[PDB]
Amino acid sequence: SMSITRLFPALLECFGIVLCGYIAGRANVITSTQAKGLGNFVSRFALPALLFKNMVVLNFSNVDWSFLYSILIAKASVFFIVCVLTLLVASPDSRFSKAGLFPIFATQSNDFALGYPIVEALYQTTYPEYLQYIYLVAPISLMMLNPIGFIFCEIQKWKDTQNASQNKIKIVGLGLLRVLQNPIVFMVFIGIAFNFILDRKVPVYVENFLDGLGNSFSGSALFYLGLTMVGKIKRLKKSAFVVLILLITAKLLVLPLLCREMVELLDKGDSVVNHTSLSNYAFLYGVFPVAPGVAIFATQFNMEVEIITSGMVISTFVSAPIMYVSAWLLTFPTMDPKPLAYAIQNVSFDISIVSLISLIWSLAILLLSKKYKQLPHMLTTNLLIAQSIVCAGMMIWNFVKEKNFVGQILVFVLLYSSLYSTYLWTGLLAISLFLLKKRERVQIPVGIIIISGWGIPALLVGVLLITGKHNGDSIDSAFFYGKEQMITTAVTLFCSILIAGISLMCMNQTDLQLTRHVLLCLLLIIGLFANLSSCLWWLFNQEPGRLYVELQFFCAVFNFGQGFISFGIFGLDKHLI
Amino acid sequence: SMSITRLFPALLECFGIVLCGYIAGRANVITSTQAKGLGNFVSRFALPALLFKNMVVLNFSNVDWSFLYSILIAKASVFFIVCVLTLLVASPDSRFSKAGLFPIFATQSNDFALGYPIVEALYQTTYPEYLQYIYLVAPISLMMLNPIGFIFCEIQKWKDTQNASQNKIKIVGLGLLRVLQNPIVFMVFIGIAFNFILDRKVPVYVENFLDGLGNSFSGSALFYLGLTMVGKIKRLKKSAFVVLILLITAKLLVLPLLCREMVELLDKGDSVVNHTSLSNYAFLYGVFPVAPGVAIFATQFNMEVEIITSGMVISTFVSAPIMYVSAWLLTFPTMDPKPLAYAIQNVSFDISIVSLISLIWSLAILLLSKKYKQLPHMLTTNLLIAQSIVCAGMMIWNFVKEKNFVGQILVFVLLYSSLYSTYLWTGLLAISLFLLKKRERVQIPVGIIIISGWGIPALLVGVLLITGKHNGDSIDSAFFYGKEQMITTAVTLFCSILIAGISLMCMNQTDLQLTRHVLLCLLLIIGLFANLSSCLWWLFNQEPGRLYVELQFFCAVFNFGQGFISFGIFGLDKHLI
């Protein structure tokens, strides 16, 4: 069905080159002026050669058109809903610029740079005909959705001049011609024409030239995307933070769900396995992040540039685990229950690799910058040390799951001590935030706080060791002692979430970077709430089923990739070192 | 043996991407500052990933070392002789900078970016094990030849500083550490180490990342070479012109012959066909042009930068036909004569294609710039028109070679009229140069000159039609009427070469760009001398053989690719348009 084993190397390639571009950008290896030359090559030479080659050899007799217009209908619905509420809820003075750029932001995926290698990895050896749908949807979506936005931004541009009847021909033709000036649209126009002229075959004198210019698009576009991302996050207020969450949620969540529903409604027919594979491919298409062209478009308009640029550089990072989690969730009903446990173990192993490397970087940054002596930052350093042992414990646990009983007990004790320590360390950080906000001075001892965070989980692990039962022959780490282990994880998560939730709500009612400290506490609380519910689900219901498998998978991701979320918040920060 | 059919698409890719980079550079699309970012990307991310990937998977038990050290011995001999005569003949004030940079220029090929696709095209489907010798020879050559040059350039820097006992450890260690700072050398060290560490297998999590970063090296590297080549030729005097000719001749002529001779002397054994293929691969390896890294090194040393940069951009342009001609000359002994004629026709067709496109460009540049009204350019526009008719006539003759007798006769008449006009237009241009040099005013009429140049070849064609015989069932155009056609081509070439040779020698003894006009006349005179000798060879000797095939091939190349030489001399010029 789907080669879900070879998706994680593709997500390593597509974001490791982006990380290389970002590292080269901050390092001062390639400045902003020099990054413009790399973008000029990619956007004028490599991308047109790639589009022209792949549409000359494209077979229009093979393409299932039902799938094609279902994906566009899904994208049209997302565009339709985002434009309507942007018109209702925004201020009249800038209602048109947002209504023309926000639905473009929520619909235009990064298909050619990020989407094509991921689809290529999952679908080359099983359904090789699904790769041509990338080159079909992205330019068709450009011609049929982008002109509608450009009229709205040009209407906002008419407002500043504030004269004449705006001469309605003059405005809609600029948006249509702005679309046609994109290199993607007319190279697709030339490729469709040359598909019938050359009879679906590239000339032999030109075949190698187009391959050499087209195969250089992938690595250089991801590198330039990483160079684009340097320092463009800026600071945003609550009203821009909230609209950014709403837009990125729209692009990465409700567009893929709309794609699945419209494909099952409109692409009717075919065999069941083909229908299921088409549905799975439809979910994967909507998860792709926003193309960097939208930030370019807001730049040329000089309208809502900060929000759209921040939205693009955030969505590319945020979509990296969403592709992985969503695709592995789709292959779960197709799998037998017994090798499903190996699938859960494989996902946690691949996540713990990325989480451990990012945690080493963030721990090194916090240690070398000597910021750990600061009052908010001491508790963060213990937390990051604890999260690193979790990821390293999964590396051990994957290879010793069927090993000797004594080694398994030691690995389980170490792994669950670090997991339980992570749970209460979120609450300790929240209590420290409440202490820095109100009740000036008379701060609690950091050593006593560290002793509680290091001792209470150890006491819980000892109680689970004393009162727990032996055996536990399972491939998953969460099932080794039985109901005693799940009761201990439920009590630790419920006490920590209630303590941190009270301290976080009390902080709002009441360099010392309290602006970002809170969000690292905030994103973990949603994780502890999902951790508590699965422990509650197992005790009250002993039957796995319709969502226990999905909830157990989500328990694995927020346990062994919490360092990734912490690194994204903390590690990418400017220091002296 | 060798897939010589698919070499010309590889040379089309490898020089079309270079031409695209040069066009983007001159167009002002990518300036010098912006080209630095693309070069930073290529040289710091794409090339190290390519070297590391291709050396991790390399099989050291498969490599024939005899070929490897034969190629290195040939390069060492070229380095030794160039250093020796650079030490003997140069001025004492700057003998060391030239002696350290000229043999690097004459030994260091551009074998990654340009060499790897050509070797891949000629040797993927027949002898796929020959591709690893590219990644083997260039870094070993770097480590074993570059430090000697860096000692010489650091001796020249000590000379300029002029103090102390020059502390020979300090200098030979600067040269060695300058060698070790190259990205190629230590990435090859890491790849050799990881070949034994990883047991000759790339890890699966890193395989796709290394493929994505390595597959983007070729096109972006050729593009950056083209951006590097913009406007760096400059002007040079007689001595620098002569030393440039000597250096590029050394790199592109005597290094491949030394490679062939040392491979047949040192790589003893194997089968006969394997020995012949190894010899052909050694010649193809030696034809590769100079890397732009030599110009980078001359820039960082700040000595002989103009000479080395001009040498690199000239060797890169000049090597494009030398690879094609040499490789098609090597496969001729392995071919029967009857499809050797088809091989000659295919070479002439591919050359006439490139010559026609470059001639269309140069004719458009000369027409739009309105420089054809100038005194020397009127004969040049007619000459370029005539050479375009030659190339289009070869295109027709290639496609109508087995067609009706009347169309073949018309095509032959048109082709040989245009060829004889090209022959005599060199002499008319030389006579015009002599008229513009001495005997001021009283210039000859341009209309009478055009009438002479268009009628005498038409009269010769009419005489060959009247006195020639019918039939001529041959695939080559040069054999249609028999000895009458070869006598007419010999008389036209001998009269034109003698008239142009007398006028060119009289010009030296005696914007109006007389500096470049002469060289276009000069490069054609060597062609007319080679054209005359093959006509003389056929009349005095009626037996084809040991060099008649090679001389007929060279007649084919200089008949249907003279437009390429003319475009390389004239078309790449700054105008107003």
Ligand SMILES: CCCCCCCC/C=C/CCCCCCCC(=O)O[C@@H](COC(=O)CCCCCCCCCCCCCCC)COP(=O)([O-])OCC[N+](C)(C)C
């Ligand atoms: C996961 C394993 C499997 C996949 C394989 C992954 C491959 C591994 C590869 C990884 C490399 C990643 C590629 C991008 C390069 C990093 C740089 C970057 O983005 O910088 C940008 C920052 O970006 C942010 O600020 C990100 C915002 C999100 C942070 C929280 C993530 C929560 C995810 C939860 C999602 C739901 C979870 C799932 C639920 C279903 C811009 O940088 P800047 O402008 O300099 O700003 C920083 C400086 N400043 C802050 C001081 C201003």
Ligand SMILES: CCCCCCCC/C=C/CCCCCCCC(=O)O[C@@H](COC(=O)CCCCCCCCCCCCCCC)COP(=O)([O-])OCC[N+](C)(C)C
């Ligand atoms: C041939 C068909 C088969 C192969 C396929 C080929 C693929 C086809 C692809 C072709 C594209 C070529 C790729 C290079 C890019 C072009 C631009 C370029 O280099 O310009 C450079 C100039 O370069 C020169 O000055 C050239 C010097 C040589 C000219 C004479 C050639 C004679 C060859 C005879 C050899 C022996 C013949 C054979 C005997 C065995 C840089 O320009 P610039 O720096 O601005 O300087 C110029 C301006 N200025 C003068 C005003 C200062």
Ligand SMILES: CCCCCCCC/C=C\CCCCCCCC(=O)O[C@@H](COC(=O)CCCCCCCCCCCCCCC)COP(=O)([O-])OCC[N+](C)(C)C
């Ligand atoms: C296998 C799965 C892999 C998953 C990877 C993805 C997940 C991991 C994700 C992320 C981890 C790394 C995040 C780095 C991003 C921040 C960089 C930064 O801010 O720039 C820094 C500079 O740059 C350096 O100092 C670079 C350090 C060397 C490269 C280390 C990255 C290793 C990536 C992993 C390789 C592991 C090995 C993998 C193979 C076993 C700081 O500089 P500054 O002070 O801001 O400014 C510079 C000063 N100046 C401007 C004055 C000059």
Ligand SMILES: CCCCCCCC/C=C\CCCCCCCC(=O)O[C@@H](COC(=O)CCCCCCCCCCCCCCC)COP(=O)([O-])OCC[N+](C)(C)C
């Ligand atoms: C199949 C075999 C193919 C073999 C091809 C390889 C051999 C052919 C070789 C050479 C062909 C031509 C080379 C031109 C190089 C000079 C450019 C130059 O000087 O810059 C020009 C600008 O740029 C332009 O105007 C570019 C012209 C369009 C691109 C070239 C089209 C033809 C290329 C091939 C199509 C092949 C089609 C194949 C498919 C059928 C002039 O600019 P300027 O004013 O002088 O100076 C700049 C100053 N300014 C910035 C202020 C303006």
Ligand SMILES: CC(C)CCC[C@@H](C)[C@H]1CC[C@H]2[C@@H]3CC=C4C[C@@H](O)CC[C@]4(C)[C@H]3CC[C@]12C
């Ligand atoms: C649930 C999935 C499918 C949809 C994606 C929504 C979530 C995960 C995304 C969308 C909006 C995102 C936030 C938007 C902006 C910022 C500010 C940045 O400085 C830190 C990360 C942070 C706080 C992001 C974290 C992840 C986030 C909350």
Ligand SMILES: CC(C)CCC[C@@H](C)[C@H]1CC[C@H]2[C@@H]3CC=C4C[C@@H](O)CC[C@]4(C)[C@H]3CC[C@]12C
């Ligand atoms: C014979 C082969 C194998 C070796 C290569 C030697 C010949 C073809 C090369 C080497 C030196 C070259 C010349 C060096 C410098 C220039 C100046 C430039 O503005 C026009 C071209 C011109 C005049 C080159 C023409 C081609 C050239 C004569």
Ligand SMILES: *[C@@H]1O[C@H](CO)[C@@H](O)[C@H](O)[C@H]1NC(C)=O
């Ligand atoms: C999908 O296509 C047809 C649908 O009838 C059928 O061969 C099968 O279900 C699938 N085939 C392939 C090759 O995927």
Ligand SMILES: *[C@@H]1O[C@H](CO)[C@@H](O)[C@H](O)[C@H]1NC(C)=O
């Ligand atoms: C070259 O290698 C051996 C030489 O003994 C022989 O198989 C043949 O000549 C050649 N084989 C291949 C595969 O090239």
